[PDB]
Copies of this chain bind each other. A is one copy, B any other.
Amino acid sequence: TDSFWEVGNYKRTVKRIDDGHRLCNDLMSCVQERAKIEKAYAQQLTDWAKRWRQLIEKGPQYGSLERAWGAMMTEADKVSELHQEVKNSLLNEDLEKVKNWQKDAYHKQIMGGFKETKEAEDGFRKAQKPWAKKMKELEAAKKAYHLACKEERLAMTREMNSKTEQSVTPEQQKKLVDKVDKCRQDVQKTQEKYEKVLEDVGKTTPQYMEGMEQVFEQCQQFEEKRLVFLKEVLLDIKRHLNLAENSSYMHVYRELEQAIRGADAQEDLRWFRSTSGPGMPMNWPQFEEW
């Protein structure tokens, strides 16, 4: 069946070691693609900010409303910075951290594979060998034992519906019941052999179970180390993705509301009156000769 205890089925466990390395590559690339995404948003915000400052300042909008409107470009510049930081953390801290763990947990052979995958193969293989050899022995003896049963059986049937018929000549057929007899002794011999192997298997089962467990437990401890470390890395990442971990993000919009609240219509109005309105100076008529 698929039981772990059947010869060969330990490979699922060996395989989990190779899978762990791959999962590290997958995670690394995954965060890597997320940093591109964050970088792209920042840059677009940065361009808008640059674009609309130029477009606004170049007249005609004047006064504290230009100032209030332009405070928005600043918020685009500041949130842009925060998202660049998310990128810098993802790449310089989290990715490198996985990267270094990897190179220390998994060492590579010139052939191809990993030291660590190979080390669990050899442990499992070594622990199963006595067992496997006994299992080939058992199946053969069972075959041999059953082969005899079937035969001696034929010799049996080939007797009742046999002798009672024609040639029950003694000078011939007494040596016939001696075929059935010969089978008797044959089933016995093979039966005893089969039971012997079966007894061998019994007494070496504890050792088989002990040895396979020691290796399994080494594998679980290797995986636990991977799981504990990954958990800590996900946490590192969540912190970095979260612009609300601290309150710089909240200050951006507080700053923004203040700038808008500061702007006054009347000031913009009074200023126009002096530079373009009645407040402007004038040289009223007066007497003029040479």
Q: Which of B40, B48, B263, B281 contacts A227 (CB 8 A)?
A: B263
Q: How many residues of A contact B (CB 8 A)?
A: 100
Contacts of A241 in B (CB 8 A): 75, 253, 256
- A165 interface contact, C-beta 8 A: no
Whether A114 is near chain B, meaning CB under 8 Å from some CB there, is: no
In the complex, whether A265 has a CB less than 8 A from a CB of chain B is yes
Q: Is A113 an interface residue (CB 8 A)?
A: no
- Tell me, rounded to whole Å, the shortest Cβ–Cβ distance linking A140 to chain B: 13
How many Å lie between the Cα of A126 and that of B184 in the bound state? Answer: 140
- Are the C-beta atoms of B13 and A277 separated by less than 8 Å? yes
Among A64-72, A99-107, A169-177, the stretch in contact with B: A64-72
A205 to nearest B CB, angstroms?
Answer: 7
Q: Which residues of B contact A40 (CB under 8 A)?
A: 40-41, 44
- Tell whether, in the assembled complex, residue A3 and residue B281 are in contact, meaning their CB atoms are under 8 Å apart: yes
Interface residue SS majority, chain A: helix
Given contacts A68-B231, A235-B257, 11 further A-B contacts (CB under 8 A): A1-B283, A6-B282, A12-B276, A16-B60, A19-B60, A40-B40, A72-B238, A146-B289, A223-B269, A244-B244, A245-B250
Q: List chain A positions with a Cβ less than 8 A from chain B.
A: 1-6, 12-13, 16, 19, 22-23, 26-27, 30, 33-34, 37, 40-41, 44-45, 48, 51-52, 55-56, 59-61, 65, 68-69, 72, 75-76, 135, 138, 142, 145-146, 149-150, 194-195, 198, 201-202, 205, 209, 212-213, 216, 220, 223-224, 227-228, 230-231, 234-235, 237-238, 241-245, 247, 249-250, 252-253, 256-257, 260-261, 263, 265-266, 268-269, 272-273, 276-290
